[PDB]
């Protein structure tokens, strides 16, 4: 999953 | 929680996102035109899990519940963020500083025409209402939180936040010189146009899962599993 | 030219209240089942136009007026209704009093098992925020107004802002205190949020039986669906 | 046509 990276970027 | 009204307003404010650019140049058929708008919002997606980041209390929530209260509302933020942009260009939305389209330009997508209409009249309610922009982070923020919160068990932590919120909004216009009657129907004119919001961004998507069928024009990786979320 | 507006919250109250929609009865398969709540639900949406009328402004606007905000919040009312009456049967949806449904007992339809899920998370939201019968038939108003307003419209807004007053006035006569008034009032107008979203994931699924045509839909539910396309 | 129209007339 693209957002789940982000989120804990 | 452990936040003042105008701490919570500040917040809200320093944690806005910028309003970036788009690629148009006048040299331009529905085509690009919507995948300009397909580059925009991807770009704006960005920046809206930057700016979640910021938003009081939903660092407190676990990742889970962060990808959920997102994949719900991810087009509802754009949207109303779309509107308080386009707040005082009338009968036009503004994208982008450089691109600013009407109701007749957005028949170049067929379906799209009645997006188009929706976002004039929520831009034309703000306008109506003379929407602050501190009042605009705070329904930008109660969206985050509220959009997703039974689509779900100790988070009811939630409420919690989304009622520091309301406290604020009232805050606001009690220092706007509005009356306890008028902070009232103030606040309930406000929330039910999330009512709205909500309606637009449940058909904007089904126009969404409309082009991703059309292959005409390819969407973002994250913007087809950002989709892949209602469909599911 | 006002009517509505000179009412007090009394009398704003006692007009909902007294206008209030009958509860119907019926008569588990897809077809045996999409066929009893279409049946149903043909049978409330008559009685509904009636609770439309006797509502305070809603005479007041043209008969085109009138048509249009029906027309896109029919199916929110249906089920703030239908969430309400399941209000105290945890887990259970309460189409009529002889017809009582589980999660489980709605996958026999499949695309109808996310609805109840979401019906049942409303009736368990106003079950666990403990609405009251006058604070549902304010938002049943709400609605009826509010949703569609954007699709003298004046007028409207000032019957909604009237019908947000009698809500402050039945939370102050509970005792509540004036944080938690403008509180419960941000609670209850967010779940119309969702109903919101629960009717466009419900008027989809409804097409979706008219291009299945395995349910034989009344064609007054179709004049009522189609005017979403 | 439309059959709300008679509803709301009725
Ligand atoms: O920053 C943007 C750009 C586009 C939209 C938008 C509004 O309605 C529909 C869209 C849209 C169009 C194409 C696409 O791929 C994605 C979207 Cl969200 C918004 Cl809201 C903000
Ligand atoms: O009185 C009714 C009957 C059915 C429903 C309902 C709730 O979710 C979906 C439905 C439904 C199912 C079939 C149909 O033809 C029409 C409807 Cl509305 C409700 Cl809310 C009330």
Same mark, same amino acid.
């Given at each position: 999953?693209?957002?789940?990276?982000?989120?804990?970027? | 929680?452990?936040?003042?009204?105008?701490?919570?307003?500040?917040?809200?404010?320093?944690?806005?996102?910028?309003?970036?650019?788009?690629?148009?140049?006048?040299?331009?058929?529905?085509?690009? #035109?919507?995948?300009?708008?397909?580059?925009?919002?991807?770009?704006?997606?960005?920046?809206?899990?930057?700016?979640? %980041?910021?938003?009081?209390?939903?660092?407190?929530?676990?990742?889970?519940?962060?990808?959920?209260?997102?994949?719900?509302?991810?087009?509802?933020?754009?949207?109303?963020?779309?509107?308080?942009?386009? #707040?005082?260009?009338?009968?036009?939305?503004?994208?982008?500083?450089?691109?600013?389209?009407?109701?007749?330009?957005?028949?170049?997508?067929?379906?799209?025409?009645?997006?188009?209409? #929706?976002?004039?009249?929520?831009?034309?309610?703000?306008?109506?209402?003379?929407?602050?922009?501190?009042?605009?982070?705070?329904? %930008?923020?109660?969206?985050?939180?509220?959009?997703?919160?039974?689509?779900?068990?100790?988070?009811?932590?939630?409420?919690?936040?989304?009622? %520091?919120?309301?406290?604020?909004?009232?805050?606001?216009?009690?220092?706007?010189?509005?009356?306890?009657?008028?902070?009232?129907?103030?606040?309930?004119?406000?929330?039910?146009?999330?009512?709205?919001?909500?309606?637009?961004?449940?058909?904007? #998507?089904?126009?969404?899962?409309?082009?991703?069928?059309?292959?005409?024009?390819?969407?973002?990786?994250?913007?087809?599993?950002?989709?892949?979320?209602?469909?599911?």
């Amino acid at each position: 999953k693209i957002l789940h990276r982000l989120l804990q970027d | 929680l452990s936040l003042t009204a105008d701490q919570m307003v500040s917040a809200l404010l320093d944690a806005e996102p910028p309003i970036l650019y788009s690629e148009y140049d006048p040299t331009f058929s529905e085509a690009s #035109m919507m995948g300009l708008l397909t580059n925009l919002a991807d770009r704006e997606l960005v920046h809206m899990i930057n700016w979640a %980041k910021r938003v009081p209390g939903f660092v407190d929530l676990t990742l889970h519940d962060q990808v959920h209260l997102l994949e719900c509302a991810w087009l509802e933020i754009l949207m109303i963020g779309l509107v308080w942009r386009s #707040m005082e260009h009338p009968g036009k939305l503004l994208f982008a500083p450089n691109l600013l389209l009407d109701r007749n330009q957005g028949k170049c997508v067929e379906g799209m025409v009645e997006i188009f209409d #929706m976002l004039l009249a929520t831009s034309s309610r703000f306008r109506m209402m003379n929407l602050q922009g501190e009042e605009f982070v705070c329904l %930008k923020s109660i969206i985050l939180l509220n959009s997703g919160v039974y689509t779900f068990e100790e988070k009811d932590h939630i409420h919690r936040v989304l009622d %520091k919120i309301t406290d604020t909004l009232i805050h606001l216009m009690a220092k706007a010189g509005l009356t306890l009657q008028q902070q009232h129907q103030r606040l309930a004119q406000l929330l039910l146009i999330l009512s709205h919001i909500r309606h637009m961004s449940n058909k904007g #998507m089904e126009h969404l899962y409309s082009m991703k069928c059309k292959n005409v024009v390819p969407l973002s990786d994250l913007l087809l599993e950002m989709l892949d979320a209602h469909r599911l």
